Amino acid sequence: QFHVKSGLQIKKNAIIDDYKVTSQVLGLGINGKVLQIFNKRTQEKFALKMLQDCPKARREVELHWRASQCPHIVRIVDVYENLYAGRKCLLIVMECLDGGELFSRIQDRGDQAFTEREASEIMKSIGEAIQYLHSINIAHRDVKPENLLYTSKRPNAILKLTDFGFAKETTSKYDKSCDMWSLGVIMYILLCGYPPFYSGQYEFPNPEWSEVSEEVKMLIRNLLKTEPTQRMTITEFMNHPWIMQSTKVPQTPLHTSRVLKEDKERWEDVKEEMTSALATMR
Template sequence: MEGGNLFKYICKRNKEPYTERDAARYIWMIVQAVNHLHTMNIAHRDLKEDNLLLTNDRNDAILKLCDFGFAKKDFLFRFPACHVAPEILAREKYDKACDIWSMGVIMYILLCGYPPFYPESEQQLSPHIKTKTRAGRYEFPDAEWRNISNEAKSIIRRMLTVDPTSRITIGEILTSPWLTELTSERPIDMTVLQDAETRQQLQAAVASATDTQRLTDDDLGIKISAPGKSRIDKRAAKKKEQMPPTGDTSFT
């Protein structure tokens, strides 16, 4: 499509600031598309950045959800690496709730520039991602999240609920005040996403979507190298060092 990938478009926005209200508009369109699928009892199962395309490169562009290759009425194990729901990692039968989790990951990225679950080292198939995802363990670091509304954080927490039966439903998201009422127009710092190396690392993690990941690392014969800080970790640490002392970091 003319507008191309949503995240690439955000990175190229130089004339106008990117705000929480912009993020809410994009999330609204994603939720509407997913809701259409769910009303037909279909799970997309491959929600990720590459599948979010804009009809043009203007601010009034419509967001389209594409790539329905995995959207079948069955329960085959296929998923993008850093967006996978914990019930899938647990090798349990899953349903449409897995899309809610993936939307939570996308919303998190739209508001800070990096995913809640990302490799601890430069390797793509990181057990660190799996451990954090299974536990639902992530943070809202103050450096990026201090100016983001509590309403936005609350929706993310409910989307990224480990128990799928307790996860927020698509209907509840559609009626949430964060989407139905005016949200903040305060600019969001997306320098992390705009960093070329960080973006490449994120794209590599997303690109590792494959049904073979349902196997363990030992099953696949993958050798895990000694952990080293990822690009995202390094940038976050540097940004934290540059910040003046503030209140406690928000945890889930």
């Protein structure tokens, strides 16, 4: 009848008491690396981000905390303030994710190809995550495809959203629209294997974009509106059939996997271009 979750708690004791810290790096986001780490008690593996600990981070995380309560958002599990170098630091410990960047898992599918229906499901999820955040006044402002990772390597495995180095509180032309834009961008790459390309016209090649119902190409439109306005709100985005169908989407073959294999070098391009497009994007 009445339900709360514990507030955020900045543990002061040395993280080394509770965890055994490796040096094996995993992630390499904004500040510092993401080290693998093990829980002495339970003995499971964890992710360790490390922060300077100044007002900024201290709030950035403050949000992640609020965010973790969501499925498709990566869960924070412990937050410590210790003294590293000589520096009031900030170690946030979160569920390690052994799944690889959303896309990096599609180009090792190997067997068969990808599905319009599988694309939905992916997008579908990603949608959710943003919703929640927005639905609590949070703009992620960095929904790149590196920042999406899966829990494990099983195809049942789910993926979550990470790196709040960029999020901001939409408190008290606007803001939480990048998050949409991205989804758009994300969907594109998801279906074909590439984005736009300027600094806006995005064509839809034959060998890829075919009988792919204009209903879909519609979405991508509404989302990509180089406008900040009329960029289909997430609330909106979710409502649109394709998404909330999950399974009522065409089973169409998708070249994307193979496409990605086609020039794995045209990628560290894409990923930077994504950080290019965003980050600055107001």
